[PDB]
Write a protein of this length. Structure first.
Length: 74
RNA sequence: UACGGUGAAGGUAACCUCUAUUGUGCACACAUUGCCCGUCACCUCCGAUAAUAGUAUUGUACAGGAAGAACUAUGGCUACACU
């Protein structure tokens, strides 16, 4: 109800961590069967899209405040 | 052609015939010159058969054996729900 609002960010933090390492272990698996069956052509579909699902770069544990300091650098 | 005068010889075993009578046989009636035979001869026509040139299909010896793949997998990836 209102706990689904907190748990959507909570479970979705879990789900994006889940999709990052799951997409990464399949992305490191299709490259092993890339050269054997010509698998680069459909492999780059995964190697683009499964990284580029809803957010590719993560929400930083710091908050990325050092990256902000790199970004607000004069 | 016709009419008389004299005027004899001579006769029965299929002994052929020309039949009949017949009642035993034909595939003959153009009624025995028939019906109709075959080796072959020139040719024509479907066979039957076959060394083989082989192509069409399957069993079996193994290589295989693709796409698939009974089985085997916990390398995974995730929520259901409960912490």
């Amino acid at each position: 109800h209102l706990h689904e609002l907190q748990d959507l960010y909570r479970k979705r933090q879990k789900r994006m961590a889940a999709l990052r390492h799951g997409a990464q272990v399949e992305l490191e698996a299709r490259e092993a069967v890339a050269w054997k069956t010509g698998g680069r052509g459909r492999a780059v579909a995964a190697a683009a899209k499964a990284a580029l699902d809803a957010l590719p770069l993560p929400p930083p544990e710091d908050g990325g405040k050092a990256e902000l300091a790199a970004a607000l650098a004069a």
